Amino acid sequence: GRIIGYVPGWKTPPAAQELASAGYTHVMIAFGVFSTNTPGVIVPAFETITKEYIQSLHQAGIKVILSLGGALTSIPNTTVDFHQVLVASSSPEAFKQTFINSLKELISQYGFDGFDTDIEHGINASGSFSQPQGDIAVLASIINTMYSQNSSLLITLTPQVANIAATSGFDQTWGNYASLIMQTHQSLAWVGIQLYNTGCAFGIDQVCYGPTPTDTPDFSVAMATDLLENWPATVNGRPTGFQPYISYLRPSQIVIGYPSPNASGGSDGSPVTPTTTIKRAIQCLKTAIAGNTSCGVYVPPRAYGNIGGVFNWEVTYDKNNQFKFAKELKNCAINGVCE
């Protein structure tokens, strides 16, 4: 499995040897944003991150992925809204060609191993959940074309829970990444779930789980389960109204994502889930056996074995906390030894 760290491109990054020693296997450079003047062009917003620094990561054995989108941009004539630049293009085909060429250019120039979809704005639902049109169809085409041309690319999705949790919804918030996953699963290294900055969302049991309380793994386990299982139309004689999500993902394509605390307990993301709970979530997904080192009340419908690992937003917090997030999770996330 994997220990994944987000590296903000507006802060001095930790040394590659510090990250490798802590147990990091992958880092995610935040962020590429979207040109409003050449629709499809990706504008690098990581001034603190050099090709030399990325070489240092590779020399330490860490893979380096370019994260696209994010929450906002301050670069003039840029947006983090995908739809906005897709519709600004002369055609969806021109947009796709420009986006692919621009992404290939950045990958070649910086030596990236792949790219991450952290597109939090402007993945609007069109067509049907099972046969999406518009934004999801175009993004799926970009992902599947990039992977078809280079099956070594690490292509990841980093959804918010509303985007992937069992839902009747299909819009820019609800179920959009679940729809995208059915179109792209064959191309994806992993889907990393943002288990923070969210209200509760539904498990396939029709129970609404949120990140608090953080002393049980239920939320982490239920959200991973929502990606690993078909969404049922009926639960115990009742209609769910759930979209017809069919799971095509392997456990190795599931990553659970959290905010890392600094030494003071501060974080960029709320709430902070302690590493003891994260290990319980992985042990629970592995075994589907409840206990004080494994499942709480929520037990998934089967044992999955080892999932894909863990990420944190973001490594400058973890560094300040002597890399306790990576150090405490690496035996569990990487070697699958969680109790």
Residue numbers in the entry: 424 to 762
Please share text taken word for word from the publication where this structure appeared:
We readily obtained crystals for ChiA-CTD and its structure was determined using iodide single isomorphous replacement with anomalous scattering (I-SIRAS) phasing. Electron-density maps were refined to 1.7 Å and the final model contains two identical chains, with all molecules built except for the N-terminal His6-tags and adjacent ChiA-CTD residues Val419 to Gly424. Each chain forms an anticipated GH18 α/β-fold and is composed of 11 β-strands and 13 α-helices. High concentrations of 2-methyl-2,4-pentanediol (MPD) were used as a precipitant during crystallization and we observed four MPD molecules in the final model; one bound to the catalytic Asp541 and Glu543 residues (MPD-1) and one within a hydrophobic pocket formed by the α5 helix and α5-α5′/β5-β6′ loops (MPD-2). The chitinase active sites of ChiNCTU2 and ChiA-CTD have high primary sequence identity and tertiary structure homology and modelling of chitotetraose binding indicates that chitin lines a negatively charged valley on the surface of ChiA-CTD. Chitotetraose overlays with MPD-1 in the active site and the MPD-2 site is positioned adjacent to the reducing end of the modelled chitotetraose. However, L. pneumophila ChiA-CTD also possesses unique features that are not observed in homologous structures. These include an additional α-helix (α3), an extended β3-α3 loop, an extended α6-α6′ loop and an extended β7-α7 loop. Examination of the ChiA-CTD structure suggests that His544, Asn547 and Gln595 are ligands for the zinc, with Asp504 the general base. Furthermore, the MPD-2 site which we observed in the crystal structure of ChiA-CTD may also represent an additional glycan surface to accommodate branched glycan structures.
